[PDB]
Motif scaffolding. Structure first.
Motif, PDB file in Angstrom:
ATOM      1  N   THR A   1     -13.813  -0.755   8.569  1.00  0.00           N
ATOM      2  CA  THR A   1     -12.621   0.053   8.726  1.00  0.00           C
ATOM      3  C   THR A   1     -11.594  -0.762   9.508  1.00  0.00           C
ATOM      4  O   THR A   1     -11.865  -1.210  10.622  1.00  0.00           O
ATOM      5  CB  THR A   1     -12.931   1.371   9.464  1.00  0.00           C
ATOM      6  OG1 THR A   1     -13.720   2.219   8.614  1.00  0.00           O
ATOM      7  CG2 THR A   1     -11.642   2.091   9.845  1.00  0.00           C
TER       8      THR A   1
ATOM      9  N   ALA B   1       2.074   4.406   2.469  1.00  0.00           N
ATOM     10  CA  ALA B   1       0.858   4.309   1.655  1.00  0.00           C
ATOM     11  C   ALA B   1       0.255   5.678   1.374  1.00  0.00           C
ATOM     12  O   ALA B   1      -0.242   6.346   2.277  1.00  0.00           O
ATOM     13  CB  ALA B   1      -0.172   3.408   2.320  1.00  0.00           C
TER      14      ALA B   1
ATOM     15  N   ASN C   1       1.097   0.923   7.537  1.00  0.00           N
ATOM     16  CA  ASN C   1       2.078   1.245   6.500  1.00  0.00           C
ATOM     17  C   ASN C   1       2.228   2.739   6.259  1.00  0.00           C
ATOM     18  O   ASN C   1       1.321   3.398   5.749  1.00  0.00           O
ATOM     19  CB  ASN C   1       1.759   0.545   5.180  1.00  0.00           C
ATOM     20  CG  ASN C   1       2.724   0.937   4.061  1.00  0.00           C
ATOM     21  OD1 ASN C   1       3.838   1.398   4.314  1.00  0.00           O
ATOM     22  ND2 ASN C   1       2.294   0.755   2.821  1.00  0.00           N
TER      23      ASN C   1
ATOM     24  N   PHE D   1     -11.565   0.366  -1.846  1.00  0.00           N
ATOM     25  CA  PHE D   1     -10.652   0.601  -0.729  1.00  0.00           C
ATOM     26  C   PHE D   1     -10.221   2.052  -0.677  1.00  0.00           C
ATOM     27  O   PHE D   1      -9.824   2.620  -1.691  1.00  0.00           O
ATOM     28  CB  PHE D   1      -9.395  -0.270  -0.855  1.00  0.00           C
ATOM     29  CG  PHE D   1      -9.666  -1.744  -0.791  1.00  0.00           C
ATOM     30  CD1 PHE D   1     -10.109  -2.434  -1.915  1.00  0.00           C
ATOM     31  CD2 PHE D   1      -9.472  -2.443   0.390  1.00  0.00           C
ATOM     32  CE1 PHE D   1     -10.358  -3.799  -1.855  1.00  0.00           C
ATOM     33  CE2 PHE D   1      -9.712  -3.809   0.456  1.00  0.00           C
ATOM     34  CZ  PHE D   1     -10.157  -4.485  -0.663  1.00  0.00           C
TER      35      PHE D   1
ATOM     36  N   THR E   1      -6.057   4.000  -9.687  1.00  0.00           N
ATOM     37  CA  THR E   1      -5.876   4.742  -8.451  1.00  0.00           C
ATOM     38  C   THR E   1      -6.394   6.161  -8.567  1.00  0.00           C
ATOM     39  O   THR E   1      -5.882   6.961  -9.341  1.00  0.00           O
ATOM     40  CB  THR E   1      -4.406   4.780  -8.053  1.00  0.00           C
ATOM     41  OG1 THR E   1      -3.930   3.436  -7.899  1.00  0.00           O
ATOM     42  CG2 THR E   1      -4.233   5.547  -6.738  1.00  0.00           C
TER      43      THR E   1
ATOM     44  N   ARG F   1      -4.833   6.473  10.002  1.00  0.00           N
ATOM     45  CA  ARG F   1      -4.345   5.112  10.231  1.00  0.00           C
ATOM     46  C   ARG F   1      -5.367   4.047   9.834  1.00  0.00           C
ATOM     47  O   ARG F   1      -5.463   2.992  10.472  1.00  0.00           O
ATOM     48  CB  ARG F   1      -3.898   4.928  11.700  1.00  0.00           C
ATOM     49  CG  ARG F   1      -2.472   5.385  11.987  1.00  0.00           C
ATOM     50  CD  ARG F   1      -2.349   6.897  12.098  1.00  0.00           C
ATOM     51  N   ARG F   2      -6.112   4.311   8.765  1.00  0.00           N
ATOM     52  CA  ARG F   2      -7.250   3.466   8.421  1.00  0.00           C
ATOM     53  C   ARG F   2      -7.295   3.030   6.959  1.00  0.00           C
ATOM     54  O   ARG F   2      -6.816   3.727   6.060  1.00  0.00           O
ATOM     55  CB  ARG F   2      -8.542   4.215   8.726  1.00  0.00           C
ATOM     56  CG  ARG F   2      -8.671   5.489   7.910  1.00  0.00           C
ATOM     57  CD  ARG F   2     -10.109   5.922   7.709  1.00  0.00           C
ATOM     58  NE  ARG F   2     -10.155   7.132   6.893  1.00  0.00           N
ATOM     59  CZ  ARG F   2     -11.258   7.636   6.350  1.00  0.00           C
ATOM     60  NH1 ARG F   2     -12.432   7.047   6.537  1.00  0.00           N
ATOM     61  NH2 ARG F   2     -11.183   8.739   5.624  1.00  0.00           N
ATOM     62  N   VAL F   3      -7.880   1.860   6.738  1.00  0.00           N
ATOM     63  CA  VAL F   3      -8.355   1.482   5.423  1.00  0.00           C
ATOM     64  C   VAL F   3      -9.858   1.357   5.570  1.00  0.00           C
ATOM     65  O   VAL F   3     -10.343   0.599   6.414  1.00  0.00           O
ATOM     66  CB  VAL F   3      -7.792   0.125   4.945  1.00  0.00           C
ATOM     67  CG1 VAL F   3      -8.367  -0.223   3.558  1.00  0.00           C
ATOM     68  CG2 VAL F   3      -6.281   0.160   4.896  1.00  0.00           C
TER      69      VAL F   3
ATOM     70  N   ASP G   1      -7.353   4.113   1.242  1.00  0.00           N
ATOM     71  CA  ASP G   1      -6.157   4.107   2.089  1.00  0.00           C
ATOM     72  C   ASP G   1      -5.911   5.502   2.648  1.00  0.00           C
ATOM     73  O   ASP G   1      -5.532   6.413   1.913  1.00  0.00           O
ATOM     74  CB  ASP G   1      -4.915   3.680   1.295  1.00  0.00           C
ATOM     75  CG  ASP G   1      -4.919   2.206   0.921  1.00  0.00           C
ATOM     76  OD1 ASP G   1      -5.635   1.412   1.559  1.00  0.00           O
ATOM     77  OD2 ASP G   1      -4.184   1.839  -0.016  1.00  0.00           O
ATOM     78  N   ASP G   2      -6.117   5.674   3.947  1.00  0.00           N
ATOM     79  CA  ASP G   2      -5.994   6.997   4.548  1.00  0.00           C
ATOM     80  C   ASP G   2      -5.111   6.942   5.783  1.00  0.00           C
ATOM     81  O   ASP G   2      -5.607   6.754   6.897  1.00  0.00           O
ATOM     82  CB  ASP G   2      -7.382   7.532   4.901  1.00  0.00           C
ATOM     83  CG  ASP G   2      -7.334   8.815   5.717  1.00  0.00           C
ATOM     84  OD1 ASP G   2      -6.359   9.587   5.586  1.00  0.00           O
ATOM     85  OD2 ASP G   2      -8.286   9.049   6.489  1.00  0.00           O
ATOM     86  N   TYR G   3      -3.804   7.103   5.587  1.00  0.00           N
ATOM     87  CA  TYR G   3      -2.872   7.005   6.708  1.00  0.00           C
ATOM     88  C   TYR G   3      -3.202   8.047   7.756  1.00  0.00           C
ATOM     89  O   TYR G   3      -3.132   7.758   8.946  1.00  0.00           O
ATOM     90  CB  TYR G   3      -1.410   7.179   6.287  1.00  0.00           C
ATOM     91  CG  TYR G   3      -0.442   6.878   7.434  1.00  0.00           C
ATOM     92  CD1 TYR G   3      -0.252   7.777   8.484  1.00  0.00           C
ATOM     93  CD2 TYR G   3       0.256   5.682   7.478  1.00  0.00           C
ATOM     94  CE1 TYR G   3       0.602   7.487   9.539  1.00  0.00           C
ATOM     95  CE2 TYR G   3       1.118   5.389   8.524  1.00  0.00           C
ATOM     96  CZ  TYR G   3       1.290   6.294   9.545  1.00  0.00           C
ATOM     97  OH  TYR G   3       2.152   6.000  10.577  1.00  0.00           O
TER      98      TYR G   3
ATOM     99  N   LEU H   1      -4.362   0.850   9.265  1.00  0.00           N
ATOM    100  CA  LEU H   1      -3.310   0.984   8.266  1.00  0.00           C
ATOM    101  C   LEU H   1      -2.047   1.458   8.983  1.00  0.00           C
ATOM    102  O   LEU H   1      -1.978   2.601   9.433  1.00  0.00           O
ATOM    103  CB  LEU H   1      -3.715   1.993   7.198  1.00  0.00           C
ATOM    104  CG  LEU H   1      -2.708   2.279   6.084  1.00  0.00           C
ATOM    105  CD1 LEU H   1      -2.486   1.050   5.223  1.00  0.00           C
ATOM    106  CD2 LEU H   1      -3.189   3.433   5.227  1.00  0.00           C
TER     107      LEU H   1
END
Length: 275
Positions: free
Chosen positions: A66, A74, A71, A85, A21, A92-94, A87-89, A69
């Motif tokens: 895209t 995250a 969650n 990947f 990560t 609201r996207r992956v 993860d960018d809350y 997201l």
């Protein structure tokens, strides 16, 4: 049952290994240090060229998707699990890469992200068949690495260079890699045994032969015609079976992959594509 990720601890190197990560503030650098892949605190994944942003991970990137997201828990993170990947809350996207078709589940363990000296980020299915120098880090994507293709004789006495490092089939019959400080990082230990020939064979085996084609030493990597032998500027020597499965430019899913070549037809550790 399946791998969990661990925090990346390789800041400043050129490779993000599988299931690690990368978090905000962490970055890769190309081996030549010109390019930097940085995950910014604002949630943008960015490549900088000598300090200036020249690329941003977004929907306009060919062969990327895209998706939402939802969650809430995250954390901001970038990682590789075959595909890459982000993860960018905050948005609201992956963001993720659409890799070439997978051939095996093993690829999930072997595929890592390389920031190359040409500024490309490349996902590479990478298997180290033999590593002569396990204590020296593997550094993919460097223009100054020496690559030998299968079918390459190591002519006795010729010094094959990679920056300040070198590989030499010596007058005494030893096959030796020397690191940047002039010390040997690896040797086949074949001095004084009547070695007459050293060759990275078409079958991907590195072999030192003596009188009557007697085998004095070999890397046990026979049966891998797509392997290359790599000497790095840091003194690392290894035989690798590698193929790219995504890149931010050049790559197309149906294109064949090849290594770039020098003007004297020698291969360079930089991936490119053509039909």
């Amino acid at each position: 049952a399946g791998r969990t990720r661990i925090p990346f601890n390789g800041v400043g190197t050129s490779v993000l290994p599988a299931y690690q990560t990368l978090s905000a503030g962490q970055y890769l650098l190309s081996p030549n240090q010109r390019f930097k892949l940085l995950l910014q605190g604002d949630g943008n994944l960015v490549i900088q060229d000598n300090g200036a942003t020249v690329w941003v991970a977004n929907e306009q990137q060919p062969f990327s998707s895209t998706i939402p997201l939802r969650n809430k828990k995250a954390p901001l993170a970038f990682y590789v699990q075959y595909g890459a990947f982000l993860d960018d809350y905050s948005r609201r996207r992956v963001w993720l890469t659409d890799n070439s078709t997978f051939t095996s589940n093993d690829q999930w363990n072997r595929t890592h992200l390389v920031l190359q000296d040409d500024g490309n980020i490349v996902l590479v299915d990478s298997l180290a068949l033999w590593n002569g120098t396990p204590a020296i880090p593997l550094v993919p994507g460097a223009i100054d690495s020496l690559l030998l293709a299968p079918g390459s004789e190591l002519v006795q006495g010729v010094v094959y260079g990679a920056g300040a490092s070198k590989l030499v089939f010596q007058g005494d019959g030893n096959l030796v890699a020397y690191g940047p400080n002039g010390a040997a990082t690896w040797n086949a230990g074949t001095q004084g045994k009547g070695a007459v020939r050293a060759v990275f064979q078409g079958d991907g085996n590195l072999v030192v032969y003596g009188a009557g084609n007697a085998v004095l030493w070999h890397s046990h990597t026979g049966g891998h015609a797509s392997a290359v032998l790599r000497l790095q500027a840091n003194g690392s020597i290894a035989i690798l079976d590698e193929k790219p499965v995504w890149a931010r430019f050049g790559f197309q899913p149906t294109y064949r992959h090849i290594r770039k070549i020098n003007p004297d037809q020698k291969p360079i550790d930089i991936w490119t594509w053509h039909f």
